[PDB]
Design a protein around this ligand. Structure first.
Ligand SMILES: Nc1ccn([C@H]2C[C@H](O)[C@@H](COP(=O)(O)NP(=O)(O)OP(=O)(O)O)O2)c(=O)n1
Ligand SMILES: [Mg+2]
Ligand SMILES: [Mg+2]
Length: 424
DNA sequence: ATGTGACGCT
DNA sequence: AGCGTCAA
């Protein structure tokens, strides 16, 4: 088995929140700019960065006051603020624009606000019958890189030389060749990305490969505004110098333990181990997954899911602002519950469903985890005052303070999340 | 003082 | 039911 059964693509919008703001404000287009929230602390936290500003070293999470030191001409757009909280509605609506266009071409898995996987296997088979026998011109792939090629002057000349080498060697007479399927898959993704750009103004990158991990990896190789085809044959050289942390799901603790326990650095080095060895170090599931993945084989399906399964609303209360009175907790719970109710009502009207569970999460001062405590209760009425009261009820006994109107230990985060959706 | 979601393990 | 991991 070689894991060449499917054609899968990952589409990822380039500097997404920036593009949404640059579409709306033409003065920001083609400029070093960033999107920021909460202007009053250090000029605001940076959440997205145009590629022009990245060349100066501006990054996500950087304070805008500090970004200005690296990039004095940097232009800023502020996220909307509602009820004292950053409001991301504009970017969720822009995401829907993009997801609905992609859904015209194939069934998508919404992976994040600006990324979706697509299983192109069926669309590829149909295109191979309609474009039966006729070769694939390089003009059908104007923004495609073939990873690993050319082999054997300027950036665009390199791109085309590699594409020419790829197409020159392609067996068009065999409608079952996996390389031909990826290539036809890339033709469709070109058409998909053109449609996104035409109908929204947004540019994106894409990876085309045989599974989600390779498609995700391929996508980043030539970002922005380009797509990359990673074939099965390209995997050994690509993985031979690919740090383990770059493969999706190996960027955290498991990936660090793969490095530390096995004494390796690159994905290809995993091939030296038996499946049983990897299962012994990392578990039956992780071990089996690593054994196949380091050969470029992965079976996680593109799930047919265009809608989030949870709808959540959180606010941080760092340092000195940590909530320390019962009246503060109740007022902020109400603020979050009101935004959640607005989102839930739109969701019920748009998507014919209703959340039936409310999860309440709090972080206490000094805890390095995102969530110190999670409790749930029934979500029976999209009513902000009821949701906030119920949320307070399930967490009120976390209060350690002997004084009633006080709250201790102070709360550095509140989080309300509606979940367990059923048809409505 | 950075500020959403999806899924695994128990 | 509640916590931990991983990624946008
Ligand atoms: N930790 C993070 C990562 C991203 N985001 C937002 C801002 C991003 O523009 C948007 C898409 O995330 P992203 O793809 O990781 N980065 P972005 O699209 O801005 O730049 P690219 O590198 O994809 O071109 O999610 C966030 O709010 N918090
Ligand atoms: Mg992106
Ligand atoms: Mg993304």
């Amino acid at each position: 088995a070689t894991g060449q059964d499917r054609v899968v693509a990952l589409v990822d919008m380039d500097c997404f929140f920036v593009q949404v703001e640059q579409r709306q404000n033409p003065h920001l287009r083609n400029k070093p700019c960033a999107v920021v929230q909460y202007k009053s602390w250090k000029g605001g936290g940076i959440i997205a960065v145009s590629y022009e500003a990245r060349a100066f070293g501006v990054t996500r999470s950087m304070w805008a006051d500090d970004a200005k030191k690296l990039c004095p001409d940097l232009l800023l757009a502020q996220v909307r603020e509602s009820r004292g909280k950053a409001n991301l509605t504009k970017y969720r609506e822009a995401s829907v624009e993009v997801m609905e266009i992609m859904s015209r071409f194939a069934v998508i898995e919404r992976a994040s606000i600006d990324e979706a996987y697509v299983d192109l296997t069926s669309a590829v088979q149909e295109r191979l019958q309609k474009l039966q026998g006729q070769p694939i011109s390089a003009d059908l792939l104007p923004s495609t890189y073939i990873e690993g090629l050319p082999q054997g002057v300027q950036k665009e000349g390199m791109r085309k030389q590699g594409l020419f080498q790829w197409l020159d060697s392609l067996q068009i007479d065999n409608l079952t060749s996996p390389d031909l399927q990826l290539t036809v898959g890339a033709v469709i993704v070109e058409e998909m990305r053109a449609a996104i750009e035409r109908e929204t103004g947004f540019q994106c990158s894409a990876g085309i490969s045989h599974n989600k991990v390779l498609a995700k990896l391929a996508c980043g190789l030539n970002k922005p505004n380009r797509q990359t085809l990673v074939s099965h044959g390209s995997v050994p050289q690509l993985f031979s110098q690919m740090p383990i942390r770059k493969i999706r799901s190996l960027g955290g603790k498991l990936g660090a333990s793969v490095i530390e326990i096995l004494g390796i650095e690159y994905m290809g080095e995993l091939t030296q181990f038996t499946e049983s060895q990897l299962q012994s170090h990392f578990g039956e599931k992780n071990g089996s997954w690593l054994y196949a993945m380091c050969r470029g084989i992965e079976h996680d399906p593109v799930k047919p899911r265009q809608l989030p399964k949870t709808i959540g609303c959180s606010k941080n209360f760092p340092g000195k602002t940590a909530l320390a009175t019962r009246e503060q907790v109740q007022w902020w719970l109400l603020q979050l519950a009101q935004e959640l109710e607005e989102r839930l009502t739109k969701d019920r009207n748009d998507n014919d469903r209703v959340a039936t569970q409310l999860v309440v999460s709090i972080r206490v001062q000094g805890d390095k985890r995102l969530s110190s405590l999670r409790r749930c209760c029934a979500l029976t009425r999209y009513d902000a005052h009821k949701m906030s009261h119920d949320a307070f009820t399930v967490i009120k006994n976390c209060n350690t303070s002997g004084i009633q109107t006080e709250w201790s230990p102070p709360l550095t985060m509140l989080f309300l999340c509606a979940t367990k959706f059923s048809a409505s």
